[PDB]
């Protein structure tokens, strides 16, 4: 589990979004496994605006932070999961690391801020849903 709180936005894995997220929807993309909802309180997360391919992510299933190299956001075939069927996920970054389904929502961060959230795993890889292209997250 986990979310990004930036301004009056909450960024979650679309597959973990709650009744309140859907009732307060701003933007969602199934192909990206991303949902953004509106919040009463103001978040302090800052979104990275960069093409960093190094960062640190939090892995709940290890209670550990791991420094990783990750691929630039791309269209990647993702096998069926306890939560989606086999399909091309967009804006996905891959790293060598540990990721179980409950690791989704763990933050990948670089020195510029939040890069993305765990979305995929298996076969010794962790996939992060990129948020750095969502410029509108830094305003309104
Ligand atoms: O959110 C972060 N991790 C903390 C770890 C303890 C509780 N879960 C959040 C995070 C991600 C990347 C780098 C640094 C921190
Ligand atoms: Zn960066």
From Swiss-Prot:
Zn(2+) 1 binds at residues 50, 52, 110, 112. Disulfide bonds: none annotated. The active site is at residues 15, 33, 104. It catalyses: Selective cleavage of Tyr-|-Gly bond in the picornavirus polyprotein. Homodimer. Cysteine protease that cleaves viral polyprotein and specific host proteins. It is responsible for the autocatalytic cleavage between the P1 and P2 regions, which is the first cleavage occurring in the polyprotein. Also cleaves the host translation initiation factor EIF4G1, in order to shut down the capped cellular mRNA translation. Inhibits the host nucleus-cytoplasm protein and RNA trafficking by cleaving host members of the nuclear pores. Counteracts stress granule formation probably by antagonizing its assembly or promoting its dissassembly. This is Protease 2A. The chain holds residues 869 to 1008 of 2193 of the full protein.
């Amino acid at each position: 589990s986990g979310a990004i709180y930036v301004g009056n936005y909450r960024v979650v894995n679309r597959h973990l979004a709650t009744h309140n997220d859907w009732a307060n929807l701003v933007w969602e993309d199934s192909s990206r496994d991303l949902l953004v909802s509106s919040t009463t309180a103001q978040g302090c997360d800052t979104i990275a605006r960069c093409d960093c391919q190094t960062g640190v992510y939090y892995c709940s299933s290890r209670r550990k932070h791991y420094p990783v190299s990750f691929s630039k956001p791309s269209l990647i075939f993702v096998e069926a999961s306890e939560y989606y069927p086999a399909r091309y996920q967009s804006h996905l970054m891959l790293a060598v690391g540990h990721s179980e389904p409950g690791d989704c929502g763990g933050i990948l961060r670089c020195q510029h801020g939040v890069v993305g959230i765990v979305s995929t795993g298996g076969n010794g890889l962790v996939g992060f849903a990129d948020v750095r292209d969502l410029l509108w997250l830094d305003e309104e």
